[PDB]
Amino acid sequence: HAAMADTFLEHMCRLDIDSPPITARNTGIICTIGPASRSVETLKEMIKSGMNVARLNFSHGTHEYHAETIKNVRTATESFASDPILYRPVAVALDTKGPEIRLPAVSEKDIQDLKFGVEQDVDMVFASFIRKASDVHEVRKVLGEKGKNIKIISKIENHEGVRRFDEILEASDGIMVARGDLGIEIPAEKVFLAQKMMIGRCNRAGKPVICATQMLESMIKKPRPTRAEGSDVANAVLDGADCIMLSGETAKGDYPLEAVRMQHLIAREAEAAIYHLQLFEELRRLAPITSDPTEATAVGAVEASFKCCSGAIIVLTKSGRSAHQVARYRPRAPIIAVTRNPQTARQAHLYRGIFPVLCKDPVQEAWAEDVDLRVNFAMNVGKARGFFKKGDVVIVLTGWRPGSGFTNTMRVVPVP
Amino acid sequence: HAAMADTFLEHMCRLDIDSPPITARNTGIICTIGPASRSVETLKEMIKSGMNVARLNFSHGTHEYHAETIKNVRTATESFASDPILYRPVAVALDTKGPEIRLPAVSEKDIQDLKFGVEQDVDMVFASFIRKASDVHEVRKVLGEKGKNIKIISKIENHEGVRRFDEILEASDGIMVARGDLGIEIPAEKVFLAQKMMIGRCNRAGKPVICATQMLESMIKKPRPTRAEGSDVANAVLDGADCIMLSGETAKGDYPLEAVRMQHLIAREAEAAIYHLQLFEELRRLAPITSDPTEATAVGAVEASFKCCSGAIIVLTKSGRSAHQVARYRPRAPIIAVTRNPQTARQAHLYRGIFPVLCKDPVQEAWAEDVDLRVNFAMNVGKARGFFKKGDVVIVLTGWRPGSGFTNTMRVVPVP
Amino acid sequence: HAAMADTFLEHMCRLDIDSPPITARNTGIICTIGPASRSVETLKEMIKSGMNVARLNFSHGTHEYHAETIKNVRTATESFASDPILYRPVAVALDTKGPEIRLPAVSEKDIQDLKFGVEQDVDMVFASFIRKASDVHEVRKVLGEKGKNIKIISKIENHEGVRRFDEILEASDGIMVARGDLGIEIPAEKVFLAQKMMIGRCNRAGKPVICATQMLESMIKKPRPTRAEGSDVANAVLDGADCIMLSGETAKGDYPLEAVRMQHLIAREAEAAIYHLQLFEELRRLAPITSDPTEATAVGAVEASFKCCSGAIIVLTKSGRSAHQVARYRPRAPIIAVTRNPQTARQAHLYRGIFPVLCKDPVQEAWAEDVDLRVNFAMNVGKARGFFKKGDVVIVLTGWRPGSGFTNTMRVVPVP
Amino acid sequence: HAAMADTFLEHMCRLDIDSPPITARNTGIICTIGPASRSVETLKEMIKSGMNVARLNFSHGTHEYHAETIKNVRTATESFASDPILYRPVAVALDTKGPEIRLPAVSEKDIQDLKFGVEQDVDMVFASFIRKASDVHEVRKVLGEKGKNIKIISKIENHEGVRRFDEILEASDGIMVARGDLGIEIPAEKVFLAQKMMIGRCNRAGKPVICATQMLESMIKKPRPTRAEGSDVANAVLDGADCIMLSGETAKGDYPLEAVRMQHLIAREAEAAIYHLQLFEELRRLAPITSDPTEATAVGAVEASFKCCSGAIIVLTKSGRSAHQVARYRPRAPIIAVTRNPQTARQAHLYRGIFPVLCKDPVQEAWAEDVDLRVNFAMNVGKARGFFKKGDVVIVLTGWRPGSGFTNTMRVVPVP
Ligand SMILES: O=P(O)(O)OC[C@H]1O[C@](O)(COP(=O)(O)O)[C@@H](O)[C@@H]1O
Ligand SMILES: O=P(O)(O)OC[C@H]1O[C@](O)(COP(=O)(O)O)[C@@H](O)[C@@H]1O
Ligand SMILES: O=P(O)(O)OC[C@H]1O[C@](O)(COP(=O)(O)O)[C@@H](O)[C@@H]1O
Ligand SMILES: O=P(O)(O)OC[C@H]1O[C@](O)(COP(=O)(O)O)[C@@H](O)[C@@H]1O
Ligand SMILES: CC(=O)Nc1cc(C(F)(F)F)no1
Ligand SMILES: CC(=O)Nc1cc(C(F)(F)F)no1
Ligand SMILES: CC(=O)Nc1cc(C(F)(F)F)no1
Ligand SMILES: CC(=O)Nc1cc(C(F)(F)F)no1
Incomplete structure (x- = not known):
């Protein structure tokens, strides 16, 4: 995988009609x-x-x-x-x-x-x-x-x-x-x-x-x-x-x-x-310094996805807010947002890159067990749809306790 | 006159529908x-x-x-x-x-x-x-x-x-x-x-x-x-x-x-x-170092036209070649090319920014006198067409002797 | 906290002799x-x-x-x-x-x-x-x-x-x-x-x-x-x-x-x-795309540390290799590397930014329990030395199983 | 002649101890x-x-x-x-x-x-x-x-x-x-x-x-x-x-x-x-747009000197002011300032790059003849001192009439 061109003019000159797009x-x-x-x-x-x-x-x-x-x-x-x-x-x-005339x-x-x-x-x-x-x-x-x-x-x-x-x-x-x-x-x-x-x-x-x-x-x-x-x-x-x-x-x-x-x-x-190298550089330079953990985690996750050429970013979300924070940095990879709230899954269509999936399964007794179930569900969806295959690398975002507003962990994991 | 934005994203955000374009x-x-x-x-x-x-x-x-x-x-x-x-x-x-089928x-x-x-x-x-x-x-x-x-x-x-x-x-x-x-x-x-x-x-x-x-x-x-x-x-x-x-x-x-x-x-x-600040920076970084006087004069002229916000670049040309060298740096100002060769004036329509004018007047006896005549002709054309008015600043390109291939002089002059 | 200047010349002009450095x-x-x-x-x-x-x-x-x-x-x-x-x-x-003369x-x-x-x-x-x-x-x-x-x-x-x-x-x-x-x-x-x-x-x-x-x-x-x-x-x-x-x-x-x-x-x-904005931009543009999880985690961690202005990056390490990967991106924050290997702790002095600490405590029976102990030890050291205080934000890097070569997790946590 | 590196880090890596400096x-x-x-x-x-x-x-x-x-x-x-x-x-x-103590x-x-x-x-x-x-x-x-x-x-x-x-x-x-x-x-x-x-x-x-x-x-x-x-x-x-x-x-x-x-x-x-590519880019971005002819001519001249790798910039000056305007853009080439005013020639030592020369010759009757004399004098000085030799390219700055404040012409000429 070769690096992106150093100038906008050089990027244009290198576009190719014999180069298949990704499935997403x-x-x-x-x-x-x-x-x-x-x-x-x-x-x-x-x-x-x-x-x-x-x-x-x-x-x-x-x-x-x-x-x-x-x-x-x-x-x-x-x-x-x-x-x-x-x-x-x-x-x-x-x-x-x-x-309207046919105030x-x-x-x-x-x-x-x-x-x-x-x-x-x-x-x-x-x-x-x-x-x-x-x-x-x-x-x-x-x-x-x-x-x-x-x-x-x-x-x-x-x-x-x-x-x-x-x-x-x-x-x-x-x-x-x-x-x-x-x-x-x-x-x-x-x-x-x-x-x-x-x-x-x-x-x-x-x-x-x-x-x-x-x-x-x-x-x-x-x-x-x-x-x-x-x-x-x-x-x-x-x-x-x-x-x-x-x-x-x-x-x-x-x-x-x-x-x-x-x-x-x-x-x-x-x-x-899209010229991702320049676009990501500009959105970063323009982002506020803030003590908010969720913002720091999202920019970490997007930055890692460019370095390892990942096949997806998987986010667990109640209100949608964690997925919306990843989407504003415009990753190349698709964002698979897993939710139990059906209205959160319909509204996520308005943001570029979010592919929403609805989990139907009942809540497990152990909370760490419930979290692993939803991550595995998102891996199966990405396999069936052709976003990646066994042995590829994905980023997984989660929080430290239940409820909205505590996303703080980013892992890099091989597709099982 | 305020400077152009520092990023491409900032340039987009500043476009204005209440801002009249130039006449050219x-x-x-x-x-x-x-x-x-x-x-x-x-x-x-x-x-x-x-x-x-x-x-x-x-x-x-x-x-x-x-x-x-x-x-x-x-x-x-x-x-x-x-x-x-x-x-x-x-x-x-x-x-x-x-x-064609209706090799x-x-x-x-x-x-x-x-x-x-x-x-x-x-x-x-x-x-x-x-x-x-x-x-x-x-x-x-x-x-x-x-x-x-x-x-x-x-x-x-x-x-x-x-x-x-x-x-x-x-x-x-x-x-x-x-x-x-x-x-x-x-x-x-x-x-x-x-x-x-x-x-x-x-x-x-x-x-x-x-x-x-x-x-x-x-x-x-x-x-x-x-x-x-x-x-x-x-x-x-x-x-x-x-x-x-x-x-x-x-x-x-x-x-x-x-x-x-x-x-x-x-x-x-x-x-x-057009985002002229980034476009001119890239075409320069990509230009060869060469001992050719005409190339060095053209890039000097384009660079000065940005610094004084000039109303035009006036070029005297036989074959067209001097005007084509200014046009490849994509100035904001129009290039008024003055010629006596009617076919050179028709072909100059293929290059962005060249506004060709045909001089009809007979050759003067003194060569420096003939040169001043054609520069004055180009000033009248720009006045009639509304590209500038009295007291504005123009760039004038000329050569040191008659014939093709000797353009080497750049002047900054007020419109008479 | 105001953003860094957009040019190198502007950065120089803004240096200040009435601005206390950090303790590290x-x-x-x-x-x-x-x-x-x-x-x-x-x-x-x-x-x-x-x-x-x-x-x-x-x-x-x-x-x-x-x-x-x-x-x-x-x-x-x-x-x-x-x-x-x-x-x-x-x-x-x-x-x-x-x-030597006093081959x-x-x-x-x-x-x-x-x-x-x-x-x-x-x-x-x-x-x-x-x-x-x-x-x-x-x-x-x-x-x-x-x-x-x-x-x-x-x-x-x-x-x-x-x-x-x-x-x-x-x-x-x-x-x-x-x-x-x-x-x-x-x-x-x-x-x-x-x-x-x-x-x-x-x-x-x-x-x-x-x-x-x-x-x-x-x-x-x-x-x-x-x-x-x-x-x-x-x-x-x-x-x-x-x-x-x-x-x-x-x-x-x-x-x-x-x-x-x-x-x-x-x-x-x-x-x-140091002009961190330009230095980090250049080291990234120059970094290879690779499927290595540890490299992707390190660049994620450094990127998050700039966004939330963190007081430290805490890394658990056997051989040192995980800390050396964070140090090559030249973070502003100190890297506190926690180890049980005394020779790994002496050699880590050769890399810019690594502050090595030696854990003396015996291995706990539960592995997740042993991991929390070493993270808490690193928090106490940073408090005693004055790198941060209660309510500040730190980045913590760990792996998914015991042994070298499995660092893959980055968390953002408040100082307890 | 190869182009300068695209980043500051790449520029450093390319410095060479087997590369003779210029004579100036x-x-x-x-x-x-x-x-x-x-x-x-x-x-x-x-x-x-x-x-x-x-x-x-x-x-x-x-x-x-x-x-x-x-x-x-x-x-x-x-x-x-x-x-x-x-x-x-x-x-x-x-x-x-x-x-002073030994107010x-x-x-x-x-x-x-x-x-x-x-x-x-x-x-x-x-x-x-x-x-x-x-x-x-x-x-x-x-x-x-x-x-x-x-x-x-x-x-x-x-x-x-x-x-x-x-x-x-x-x-x-x-x-x-x-x-x-x-x-x-x-x-x-x-x-x-x-x-x-x-x-x-x-x-x-x-x-x-x-x-x-x-x-x-x-x-x-x-x-x-x-x-x-x-x-x-x-x-x-x-x-x-x-x-x-x-x-x-x-x-x-x-x-x-x-x-x-x-x-x-x-x-x-x-x-x-010196990393001239980045330094000249920054001083330009920071320069005001102004209707002053002398400023537009100076930046044109510096820009042309980079494109043709010239051996010098020759400026005729009474008060010094035209040479000071070229010097603030930090050209690679030496600036040879020719003057008749002995105090102007002593003070020009305070600006980086100005090599001042004092013309002793009497004023000629024809003004265009007096101008050619001083340009020829500056060519001989540069030859004797080893700044260039016959067949090299120099930039020459002059004005349209006698007196201070009318510098407006830039020529590219071979050394006679
Ligand atoms: O609605 P948001 O802010 O996206 O919050 C996502 C939240 O989902 C979780 O990852 C999992 O929480 P639930 O088990 O309650 O669904 C939390 O740890 C995190 O705070
Ligand atoms: O055909 P080109 O290369 O554009 O040449 C332009 C030439 O026109 C001049 O400016 C004027 O020449 P003429 O008087 O012969 O038309 C020359 O000094 C210059 O060399
Ligand atoms: O020597 P390295 O590559 O820095 O490895 C760090 C390793 O330390 C750990 O974080 C903890 O391992 P130990 O409990 O065996 O010390 C691993 O999960 C990780 O793989
Ligand atoms: O003192 P300054 O502004 O540098 O002025 C330089 C002046 O020298 C000239 O080039 C030559 O003038 P003199 O013949 O009077 O010395 C003028 O055409 C120009 O205006
Ligand atoms: C707004 C914008 O970015 N336009 C654009 C991008 C490209 C391409 F070169 F990236 F494709 N061309 O035009
Ligand atoms: C190729 C290119 O430059 N496209 C472009 C420019 C702009 C604008 F923002 F400058 F207008 N939008 O799309
Ligand atoms: C190599 C290098 O970066 N030198 C340097 C930096 C600065 C400062 F302005 F950033 F301090 N001055 O000189
Ligand atoms: C202030 C400054 O520019 N310092 C500097 C330049 C270089 C060099 F790499 F250009 F030489 N090193 O340190």
Whole structure:
């Protein structure tokens, strides 16, 4: 294994089209559900193709039509639960209508929609047309105490949004760059600047950023994308997007499965071309000195994974927080997060590199025995999926006692 | 004027949508001529919109139809010759058919086409389906002695081309990345890797690279591009392409002028987001130590242009070679090259940043007097076009005696 | 705690004379024993002042005179063994005469000397006038099987030595730059170049390098050093020397204790001025990718120690090898190595940053219980010596089973 | 000619003792004159050995004894004026007594001394015990209007001096690090920190810094220096000192000429080991963007000198200011400054790299003819001294009209 080039120009000159990527795919895929992909049979196919999140668009349709979509997604998802080693969690996301002309943060219709999403147990909310930090605080208040674990992703879609960006990011759980709407309010040749500014600031803060709208638009009518569309998805992944989103392509178009399969192939290839040497150097130089044990353990773990070219980082997590701390240093290796909390496993799709697995097994009596069981479970999953094989090296992160907030141990172990 | 950020991540975070670009546009625009843009009236409009090069596609049409296209381009071009300060040179390029199925380097039909282009006085040839260095040597031999100043740009469009790339680049004058054809021969998710490898190697060699095919494809039917198409043109400019090319958009589509105007606006905006501090540092570290005076003068001139934030670099040139040496260091400022040779002025469109001007005035008796005349001419052009105004600072490059190969002097002068 | 400067020039500009150093002193001190410091009473004072190694010079004196020096050093050393928390191990080193005029690698007299040092149980040998790798192999053969754990440090002292340096370094355990002799064989204004070349190559190989001769020479006659002597010791520490050596100053001079105390104060101050940000970045970029678990754990541990500003790295070691792997990344924090092997504890003085402690306690029945005992012992030592206090953060390195070669675990723990 | 290493560690590893330095010596040599070196015969020998500046110490002696020293230095200097190509200018410097116990900035005795130095036409004043910016303003006021061109170098020698350093540097023309006195007022192990902080800040401001006291102290009694003294002079040159100073060694000692010759040899060797690639990169990143033509020309000239490995930079100067602007970028090549002003030629010894030459020839009638004469004079000097030979490449800096402040032209020319 040869070292990475010393300059950015030398790195580019060395890229190779005869060099197979690794089996894992770090970037998450979000699909809009609509007339062309509502059926249980089609949804089973989208799941096997690589869909992680199902977005429902509350611009159209009644509550009763939407509740029958949520039921089909869940049926499709549980059809795979028979074999715990190959089961994939799938999140559900609710997109609001917002202040729209066909004005206040949350309209009267949006109250009803948000309140409906707490009852149906969704994982995240995409709030349309956010202009200031007090709009996010309004949405957090309508979800109440019952929905205090639902994540809010703020949609940036006008000039005021871009100008007040830093205060919106401090209030939100994540950001969505909404290129369609944004490309009407500002001049279209400036959209690429707003996109890169916003991906840059979220990477620096360690928060999730989603790139949306018109990514594979020609695949509505034809089964292959144009040359421009292939380069637009790759460039979002190389700038640093956590997830990419399909709209029309999966909702209304003629080839929903081919579009999901195209995003899977491109993203995997772009991930092998990241210049990891310079990116990791910069995120370190920019990290605070702090007495927090969990932060010190995460940066240790990422640093060791580069030195031994490991096949994975295995993290045990209750709330997700330990896996989110490893993911902000952007390792090359996949992060396999093992959890017993089903909602923690659905939300972990928003962070780049986290591959979440749900442990079904009952708690053992001896606590050290319970810990070994979950580590062995994560080894079997990585073997079945082809992330590594017997005799390879993995990093394992754990804590010193039960409960959240005590991750402090990093081990380097051979795959049994 | 504040200094550039110390890291790449910090540079991204600081991009601003409320920051007007400079008037100059460094990247060249190549348009295909066909049924929708053959007329003298439409060509006059394309020239004012920003077209620098006219490509003729010898896949279709007779010699007699093509000769009437060359006559209309030249008429349109000379219609502006009345005012020497505002005249723009426009190059003509001949694209061969190549070994095509609807096999040797140059077919029998291609002999006739190449020989036709020497008689019509074209500036460059785009040779289709180049696989090895001995294919380029074949094309150079058919042009003969009469066409020894015609530039050969090699089209890379299959797996063999990509594998033998380094020897093709040493033989050619320039390279074209032909994404359409290349995206069938290799898997479509790998095209973006071949593109970046090839732009990287040409920047390192100081040779021109052109990015072609499907860049604004939706503008055939609609007057605005999709969000993906806007980001694909910007990313080619940020990777380091010298020129971008329109095909269907200008040949067959419904909105040829709008497509030329869209490429002009995007390219200007992307040029203001280049991270010049790191790019110039890398090209220097990679440059040979050599006893050549002209090379030492060019790097001096580029270095001074960053320190005083100059409005232009003015170069007097016979063969073009002095301007090509400044352009490989990628200055922020425009390079105004003043020449008396009309063919040197048409070919200078292939290098990023060169704005060529043709001096019409008769040679003065005293040689130092002739030199001052051409420098004053270049100052008037920059004033009329809005690159700078009275009291600004420009760099002026000249030589110590007449003839090619003696550029050795750099001055810093206020605009009179 | 503010981040380090972004450039070397900015780092220099920020040094401060009103900024107290940390209590630990990373660089080791080697003293020559002679007429002025042979007594048990004076040696007790040298030990408390900071001496780690006692060098015997076999140019003069009989075997019987030397054996009485070794007995006084050992008496002085064991006088402190009553309190296990405050005991300091002290190594003994035997310096050969070599091929000297007042010729083969090992003279007949040197056989007798080497064979005498195996019987007296020394820790290291300083072999004079090494010219080629086959000279080191000769010395290794005379020590035999009985002295296979004695370390060989090669003395570089002529032109041939410097020219064949790379092959001598691969054969040796460590290197000594012998400036006195070297400054006669090569021109004296070139000695500083040979010194920096040799410190550079040993840091790159992760091997110990010692800087010797005329460091505090004026302190033979006067109780204070000259301004030049103060800057010469600091500069050896900033280039990267593992240890510094006194000769005349402690052997023959009038102020042996003041000279030991001066070296202690200077070295401590120079260690606080190292530019750790750039040094750690370079040693990483230069490190091989390897499947060795112990290497991956060490670089993880050093990386975590910078992020949480830890007060120490605690390593359990049989052979020393785990501590030597942490030391080559040059942490800011002290490395406390806990061992049961007394010879491993004496030899660890040759590596920068290792503070060795000898565990006296009997082996516990349960192996995990034995491990906790030795970690607690190292915490008490660090508390007594003032390296940290209750509530601070330390890194602890251990293995998964008993025996050498299985270090694989890194924990971050609060001081109890 | 191979490129410099990519890292600082790699640069160190590549230093070579079998690699001859260039003939030029960039760092200036300052000698104290006293009983052992007052005679005309000995001073002629010191000049040929490499002395640039003669310091008079006004702690002892009457005005009448000092005036006879100034007369012998000037006689010795003019003895070489017969051949204009080989003449070396020599500056005279007056060191004050200061507020001393054996209190105000300038004592009553110091008024008399300063006023005496204006009458004797000295070039610089070394003001003892400067504590605040208002002390420098006091000295500037006593020199008056008559001595407004005399340079003030401030001596830093206590704790208050170091704390208020930044305001003292803005008021002064240059700084002297006075290690002898400073090493009593602060603890001696901290002197090396104060030295590096102060050299760093002066390099950043582009002002001269002198390193003084106890540099070759053992050469008072013996004809060779100790190993520590050889490394102390080299390290001041590698930190970035403009000049080094001898005191006792030339004033009172037994071997004045050998001491001057030792400083010459060491300094020449250290200059060949500077890591120019990183140093020039940092000084550029730190330089302001400004509309000043002279600054833009200087950085252009230094940048071209690295690219063509030139043998010299030739600058025509009235006040010195154009040469001082080239010197702050620390070129590898010598700067030959040609002047007609004799006081400008003596003061240019304080800046690293400037080799000043005095033109004696009468002004020509045609101004362009006068300019060519002085450039030819500088070529002959460089040939006689061995800085280059026929066919080599030099950089030549000039202005567009007569008078100070119009340098704007850089040429690359072969040596005739
Ligand atoms: O939610 P988080 O902060 O990621 O916490 C992870 C926690 O999981 C553990 O590793 C195991 O805890 P449980 O046995 O309670 O699941 C703890 O030791 C650690 O503190
Ligand atoms: O063709 P090139 O190498 O760019 O040469 C530029 C040449 O033009 C000049 O600047 C002016 O020459 P002309 O007067 O002959 O046009 C020369 O001094 C210089 O050598
Ligand atoms: O000699 P080395 O390679 O430093 O080995 C350190 C070894 O010490 C241990 O940490 C403890 O071992 P012991 O109980 O046998 O002393 C092992 O787990 C580890 O392999
Ligand atoms: O004193 P400075 O600023 O270094 O000025 C250098 C000046 O010397 C010149 O090069 C020559 O001037 P003179 O002929 O008056 O000596 C000017 O063109 C330039 O402005
Ligand atoms: C934002 C960014 O990093 N872009 C990029 C990366 C590359 C590559 F060279 F790494 F692939 N090209 O463009
Ligand atoms: C190849 C390359 O440099 N890509 C790139 C640059 C940027 C920007 F941040 F400079 F704009 N983003 O992607
Ligand atoms: C070899 C080396 O690193 N030298 C050095 C370091 C410094 C300081 F600035 F870091 F202290 N000065 O000189
Ligand atoms: C301050 C400084 O730069 N010190 C230094 C330089 C070198 C060398 F390696 F460049 F020589 N060693 O120590």
